[PDB]
């Protein structure tokens, strides 16, 4: 009973269920085969997320939201192992976005550019998962256009946001599955459960 907080399995699922619910619920998504929609959020997912955390994360300093009430700092990170990733993370992402005031059509664009990758392997409809991520393109630059029209090199400083995310989405996968640890602080913080 002291540590059956590992709801943080059922927080994580619901997390994952609700990246599934986003990829959905995007264009054009659903329209192509089961196969290849299960092959391109197992590929992608990520980035898709440290997209979107990173994204939650501008308005704190020197931490990740993760969901609910997590909130990921960076003694927790670097006591994880992970430190240079969530130093990465924060650098390259939070405070990018945080700068370039990056909103969340904006993210949902280069989250539906990531999840749009037609170099993944077993794709059949290959060409068409290509050009869906063009037509992501256009409207983005679209978007960029009307919505800034005095920033005429914002287009490419969004797209510069993507190699990042790969590398790091590569760095990842030194599994930043080490806030599972979140399990045992909770009960750590309810046995000094007190000076409320």
């Known amino acids: 009973a002291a540590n059956a907080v590992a709801n943080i399995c059922q927080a994580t699922n619901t997390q994952l269920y609700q990246l599934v619910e986003w990829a959905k619920h995007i264009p054009h998504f659903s329209s192509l085969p089961i196969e290849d929609q299960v092959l391109l959020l197992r590929a992608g997912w990520n980035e898709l997320l440290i997209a979107a955390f990173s994204h939650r994360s501008v308005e704190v300093r020197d931490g990740i939201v993760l969901g609910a009430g997590i909130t990921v700092h960076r003694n927790s990170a670097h006591q994880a192992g992970v430190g240079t990733i969530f130093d990465r993370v924060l650098t390259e992402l939070v405070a990018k976005m945080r700068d370039m005031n990056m909103d969340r059509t904006e993210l949902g664009s280069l989250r539906s550019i990531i999840l749009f990758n037609p170099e993944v392997r077993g794709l059949k409809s290959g060409q068409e998962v290509e050009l869906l ?38 760095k990842c996968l030194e599994h930043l599955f080490f806030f599972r640890l979140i399990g045992d602080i909770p009960i750590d913080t309810f046995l000094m459960d007190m000076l409320g």
């Open 133 to 170: 991520r063009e037509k992501v393109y256009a409207a983005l630059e679209e978007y960029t256009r009307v919505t800034r029209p005095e920033e005429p090199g914002r287009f490419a400083k969004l797209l510069l946001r993507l190699p990042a995310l790969r590398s790091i989405g590569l």
